[PDB]
Amino acid sequence: VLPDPIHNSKLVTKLINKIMLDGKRGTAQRILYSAFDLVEQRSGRDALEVFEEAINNIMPVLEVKARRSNYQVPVEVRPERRTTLGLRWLVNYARLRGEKTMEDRLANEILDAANNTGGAVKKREDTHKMAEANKAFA
Amino acid sequence: GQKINPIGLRVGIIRDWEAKWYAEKDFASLLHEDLKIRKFIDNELKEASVSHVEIERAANRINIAIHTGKPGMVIGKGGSEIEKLRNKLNALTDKKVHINVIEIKKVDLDARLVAENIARQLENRASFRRVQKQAITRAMKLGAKGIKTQVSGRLGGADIARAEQYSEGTVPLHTLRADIDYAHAEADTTYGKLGVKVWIYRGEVLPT
Amino acid sequence: RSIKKGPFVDEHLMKKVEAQEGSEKKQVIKTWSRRSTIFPNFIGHTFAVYDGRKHVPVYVTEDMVGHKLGEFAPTRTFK
Amino acid sequence: RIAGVDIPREKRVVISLTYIYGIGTSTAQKILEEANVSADTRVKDLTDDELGRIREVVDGYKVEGDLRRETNLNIKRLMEISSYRGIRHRRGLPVRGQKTKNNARTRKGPVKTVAN
Amino acid sequence: VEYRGTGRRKNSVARVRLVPGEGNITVNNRDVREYLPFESLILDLNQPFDVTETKGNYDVLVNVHGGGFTGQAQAIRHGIARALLEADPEYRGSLKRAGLLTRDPRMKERKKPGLKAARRSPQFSKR
Amino acid sequence: KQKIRIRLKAYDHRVIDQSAEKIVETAKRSGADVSGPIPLPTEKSVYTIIRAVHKYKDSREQFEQRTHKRLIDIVNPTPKTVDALMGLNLPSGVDIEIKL
Amino acid sequence: AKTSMVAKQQKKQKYAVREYTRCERCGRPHSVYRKFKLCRICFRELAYKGQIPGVRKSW
RNA sequence: GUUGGGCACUCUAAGUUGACUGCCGGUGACAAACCGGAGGAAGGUGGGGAUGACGUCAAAUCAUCAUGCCCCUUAUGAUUUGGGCUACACACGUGCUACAAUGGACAAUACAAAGGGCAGCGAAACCGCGAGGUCAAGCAAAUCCCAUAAAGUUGUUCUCAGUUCGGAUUGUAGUCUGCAACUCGACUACAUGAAGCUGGAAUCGCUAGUAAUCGUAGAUCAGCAUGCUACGGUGAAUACGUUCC
RNA sequence: AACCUUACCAAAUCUUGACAUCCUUUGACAACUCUAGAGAUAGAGCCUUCCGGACAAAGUGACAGGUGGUGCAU
Ligand SMILES: [Mg+2]
Ligand SMILES: [Mg+2]
Ligand SMILES: [Mg+2]
Ligand SMILES: [Zn+2]
């Protein structure tokens, strides 16, 4: 695929195509751009910088596979599934960060993740917690 | 496994519509006309060994063309029988109709003629097995690349049904080049209704 | 009726009500015509409507005006 | 209070009138056309004279009590003469030619599962 | 003078005529950002230039019909890219390496009987 | 300009093409000032049936009925070409329609 | 009660709304195409036999 | 682009070219074949259909039709009117509408495809709030009509509520069709405004222009579609991989 | 699936019949009105005209008719 017009990044477009509902790329585009505007408003610095820091935080490094009773055995996450899960959890836990507008939701989610807080980081550490707990089965 | 009629598969590819006329609107009359002609030829068809009729229409004329291998029985000797046909047929239609008897030699190579024959044999209470055997025998002597035959129903007066078929040669249905001539007929046997299907494939040619 | 050009009523019924204008008070009047509307010219005339199996009597009132005999000839005998 | 109900106050006049039984959106817009006030306004911030114009206007309509009484009177008429519609009212079944087999949970009410 | 192209993409046809100029682009007697809402559309439009450093050396006029803005714009992109060869046949190799000349055959599929769409079958239940 | 225009409607391209070629050559043989053969968008209807007798609506058979349309004009007529067009009542499965 | 109703539809009727189409060779009301005045079955029969112009199974 | 003019371009549609492991390298029994590459619009049956072997399920159909045997034949046949196939304590299946801010309402503005049309398609103008009505143009089609595509975009507003959500139900008044809309058509205007805050055990579909979503068209058809068949617009996520069902 | 469709039910009606092939009387035919009927229906008309085939009825017994059963005879 390609990078985005305003910022020239692959991840932004890959994230638009995951926020997008029913192929409303422009709606998703609007709300993500306004979120970058609003996270430049609050916590004044570059939207890409804060965003990339956010995904560096929440993007995990381990995973589990459920097999057999049912063991759940750890495994090293692929570097593509890394960004995949990061962006997915970012969007979803934004959507359930529960306030008025999704741009505000997203802004707060990237903000909290940038400061290593937020539901996405919670899921990350849950994942690693259950992984190391199940480390015996590797 | 519920397979289709190959003539229906091939129409518009290697063989053409037997009805060869246009009408923007009035199929609602003209197609029923075509069918009623197709039915009225019961007269000939009962004995005259007619394979198929093609039909063409114009502003003035109808031009019909009946294929057979015993054409004498439809033209009388000089024309008495075709004129007998024109009278009643044109009375039905109410339009000027000119006909064209046309000959297909080699009558034991034509699907509907084989089917008609085996039906009348089985009404005369012969044996399905010998019938299909000798049909394919004579067809292969006439030099066809493939024949297939099938009869289905209450064979031998049996209490229940069967489907028996024979073949010799190649009958490549899924090939669309192949101009395989299929025909179905029936036989109102004293026990029930025997349904006969027959298939010939007499080498490969295109209409173009 | 659904439209405003003229209501509807069967002639063989209206002719007979108008015949029965004199109000002899012994009269009923039978019909299979559940399709009929009820003009104000029917008030008091008891009608015998065919429900599908039976001629049911109905008395007519000043509230039954914009209505139909079928509305008061029940058909499905549920209980 | 306008039709006896002190309609909501933070809202705009249109929607706050919509919480009158008998006054929907069409009539709200017409009423505000009649008594000249922009619908963008709000009942708390109004001039009381405008509010009085509105109430004078509204008085010329069938509203809460009269409307319920009129509707139930029309209904009970046909219930009494026992039309098809009147009986379907009497029995809590739908009236408008609907199907009473799988649907009609509204007029019926909740499920009452019988054993097969 | 002119250098012309006929881009097509997803039931949308675009007739491009590159000419030298400033960077303007008109589309059915209208400007781009007038006509098209988005901007990644315009990125895709201008990407063939970006492959060859030809960003501002040409204006564009296009006559277009069919479909909707996105594929309409990819068709603009394609006709532009193909006209660039009529202007400069040696850019063929860069447009090859980048895969810019392929007319996307990705057309909408035929609904099929028994299905509610091209692939989607109805909801099935044994019981 | 002073032109004949003729429409051919046919259910088959490999016969309407030859009929068109006949009439075209006859006009530019018995006259002059002829337009080309002009294809028109070729209508097609489609009737869809269920392959069955009783039920099984899930299975279908879709039949198309094409209708090819081919237009020609004869610019600036002469009676020779008029006559050699109207004196060609051929073939069967094609509706010709003159317009003058 | 087929052939009676065949006669019946082939007759005129007391008002035009009652007039319904059925296929002319098989007295079948449903799945009639009023161009051909044929039902779906007989349409297949005849178009397979080649007795209906234009027609060709598609795609 | 209408009209004078050109048929260049698009397009239309007949013929043709094109793609075949055809070529380069490596692998491999040197063979088939695989992997990669070039070229090329496209590459590895390009994508999608059509085509469904012998036969299994005494599967379905005697209500498409045809037909053996059996049965009724002043009635199990035939004619009309009216009713019913539309019931209603309940259960199952298939779908539609929603349970809203990625949204609702209002205003302006933009880009399609495939199809239908003769006693039928009904532009414009006008009347009606709207369903629609009067007149009446063009049109048997690449002419004219159906037919403004909607989502989208640009603004404003509403600001988290059983709500300006949703639009069931019922009341009144109307429009079209029709021989007539009670049972039993659709539609409109007004009024009302229910259940419902994303669904338990279970379970379905889908590997790309797909899924998802938004509109459109058509057969049947006087009239009636959330159904069926067909069309385009926007447009993904992922495929580690075969341990499990 | 408003009527018809509709096969079902109620009421009302017919019994070579709503439909076909045959004999013969015949004949060209009727359309379109009015009374009564719920309608089918009869009943008055209206003057329909051999173009030996054709339309139209009428007596006739052969006969029709059956969405009636068996899809485990086909
Ligand atoms: Mg194959
Ligand atoms: Mg069985
Ligand atoms: Mg009836
Ligand atoms: Zn039929």
Select from B2, B3, B18 the residue whose CB has the most chain G CBs within 10 Å, as the one to mutate to test that interface.
B18
Number of H helices, E strands in chain E: 4, 4
C-alpha span between G8 and F52 (Å, rounded): 28
Same structural domain for residues B159 and B181?
Answer: yes
Give the phi and the psi of residue A27 in degrees, each rounded to 5: -60, -50
Domain boundaries, chain A: 1-138
Assess contact for E8 and E75: CB atoms under 8 A: yes
- Residue D11 structure tokens: 């809202």
C-alpha span between B16 and B14 (Å, rounded): 7
C-alpha span between B149 and B165 (Å, rounded): 5
* B9 within a domain of the structure (yes/no): no
The total of structural domains in chain E comes to 1
* B30 within a domain of the structure (yes/no): yes
CB proximity under 8 Å: F 3-22 to B: 9-12, 14
* B5 within a domain of the structure (yes/no): no
* B8 within a domain of the structure (yes/no): no
C-alpha span between A127 and A92 (Å, rounded): 16
> B62-68 and B101-103 as β-strands: parallel, antiparallel, unpaired?
parallel
F51 contact G CB<8A: yes
Same structural domain for residues B114 and B199?
Answer: yes
Bridge partner list, E65: E13
Q: Where are the alpha helices (DSSP H) in chain C?
A: 11-19
Give the list of residues 6+ apart from residue C66 with CB closer than 8 angstroms, or none. Answer: C37, C38
CA B191 to chain centre: 25
- How many CB atoms neighbour CB A43 within 10 A? 14
Distance CA A84 to C1' H245 in A = 27
Same structural domain for residues B94 and B121?
Answer: no
DSSP chain D: --SSS---SSSBHHHHHHTBTTB-HHHHHHHHHHTT--TTSBTTTS-HHHHHHHHHHHTTS--HHHHHHHHHHHHHHHHHHT-HHHHHHHTT---SS---SS--HHHH-S--PPP-
Assess contact for A105 and A34: CB atoms under 8 A: no
Question: Which nucleotide is the nearest neighbour of E121, by CA and C1'?
Answer: H205
Residue G54 Cα distances to B25, D98, F6, F65, G34, angstroms? 13, 45, 21, 5, 16
- How many CB atoms neighbour CB C69 within 10 A? 26
Site of tokens 């039976």: C54
Closest partner residue to B28 among G35, G55, G56, by Cβ? G35
C-alpha span between D54 and D28 (Å, rounded): 10
Among F94, G53, D105, smallest CA distance to B11 is for G53
C-alpha span between A10 and C15 (Å, rounded): 86
Give the list of residues 6+ apart from residue E96 with CB closer than 8 angstroms, or none. Answer: none
Bridge partner list, B192: none
Q: Which residue of E has its CA nearest to F62?
A: E113
C-alpha span between B139 and B114 (Å, rounded): 9
Q: Which residue of G has its CA nearest to B25?
A: G35
> C28-31 and E25-27 as β-strands: parallel, antiparallel, unpaired?
unpaired
- Please give the order of strands across the beta sheet that includes B181-187: B162-169, B146-153, B194-201, B181-187
G48 contact B CB<8A: yes
G27 touches strand H (CB under 7 A): yes
Which technique? Answer: cryo-EM
Binary contact (C71, D77; C-beta < 8 A): no
Bridge partner list, E25: E60
Among B104, E78, B170, B33, smallest CA distance to G53 is for B33
C-alpha span between B156 and B162 (Å, rounded): 10
C-alpha span between F89 and B39 (Å, rounded): 29
- Residue C29 structure tokens: 């009047």
B18 contact G CB<8A: yes
Which ligand number lies closest to the CA of residue G5? 3
Site of tokens 């094409």: F66
Q: Which domain holds residue B82?
A: 16-105
How far F2 CA lies from chain E's nearest CA (Å)?
34
Same structural domain for residues B96 and B140?
Answer: no
**Per-residue burial over B131-145, b = 16 or more CB atoms within 10 Å of its CB, e = otherwise:** bbeebbeebeeeebb
- Residue E50 structure tokens: 């970006």
Question: Which nucleotide is the nearest neighbour of D113, by CA and C1'?
Answer: H90
Binary contact (F92, B16; C-beta < 8 A): no
Domain boundaries, chain C: 7-78
Q: F41, exposed or middle or buried, with CB in 10 Å at 0-12, 13-18, 19+?
A: exposed
Resolution in units of Å: 3.1
- Residue A105 structure tokens: 């939701």
C-alpha span between E101 and E71 (Å, rounded): 14
Assess contact for F86 and F45: CB atoms under 8 A: no
C-alpha span between B109 and B48 (Å, rounded): 16
Same structural domain for residues B101 and B118?
Answer: no
Same structural domain for residues B28 and B93?
Answer: yes
Give the list of residues 6+ apart from residue D43 with CB closer than 8 angstroms, or none. Answer: D7, D8, D9, D11, D12, D13, D16, D51
**Per-residue burial over E25-44, b = 16 or more CB atoms within 10 Å of its CB, e = otherwise:** bebeeeebeebbebbbbbbb
Q: For strand H, which nucleotides have at least one atom less than 7 Å from a protein CB?
A: 9-15, 39-42, 46-56, 58, 60-61, 63-68, 77-95, 101-103, 110-113, 115-116, 118, 140-142, 149-154, 157-160, 163-164, 168-186, 189-194, 203-213, 219-222, 228-240, 243-244
Q: Which domain holds residue E34?
A: 1-125
Among A58, A50, A100, smallest CA distance to A77 is for A58
Cα D4-D6-D10 angle, rounded to 5 deg: 155
- Residue A49 structure tokens: 């910088």
Binary contact (B7, G35; C-beta < 8 A): no
Site of tokens 């009452």: D112
H/E segment holding residue A59: none
Tell me whether residue G47 is annotated as binding.
no
**Helix F79-86 × helix F13-27 angle, to 10°:** 150
B161 Cα–ligand 2 center, Å: 14
H/E segment holding residue F93: none
How far G36 CA lies from chain F's nearest CA (Å)?
11
Site of tokens 């303007």: E24
The total of structural domains in chain B comes to 2
C76 touches strand I (CB under 7 A): no
Residue type at B68? T
- How many CB atoms neighbour CB F26 within 10 A? 19
End residue of a domain, out of B73, B105, B137:
B105
Among B130, B123, B129, B124, smallest CA distance to B187 is for B123
- How many CB atoms neighbour CB G14 within 10 A? 6
Site of tokens 């849950």: A126
Beta strands in chain B (DSSP E): 50-57, 62-68, 97-98, 101-103, 146-153, 162-169, 181-187, 194-201
End residue of a domain, out of B63, B83, B105:
B105
Assess contact for A16 and A5: CB atoms under 8 A: no
Assess contact for B123 and B181: CB atoms under 8 A: no
End residue of a domain, out of B69, B87, B105:
B105
**Per-residue burial over D48-81, b = 16 or more CB atoms within 10 Å of its CB, e = otherwise:** eebeebbeebbeeeebeeebeeeeeeeeeebbeb
Tell me whether residue G23 is annotated as binding.
yes
Which ligand number lies closest to the CA of residue G33? 4
3-state secondary structure of B93: helix
Give the list of residues 6+ apart from residue D40 with CB closer than 8 angstroms, or none. Answer: D12
Largest interatomic CA distance in chain D: 66
DSSP E59-119: EEEEEEESS-HHHHHHHHHHHHHHHHHHH-GGGHHHHHHHT-S-----PPPPP-TTSSSSS
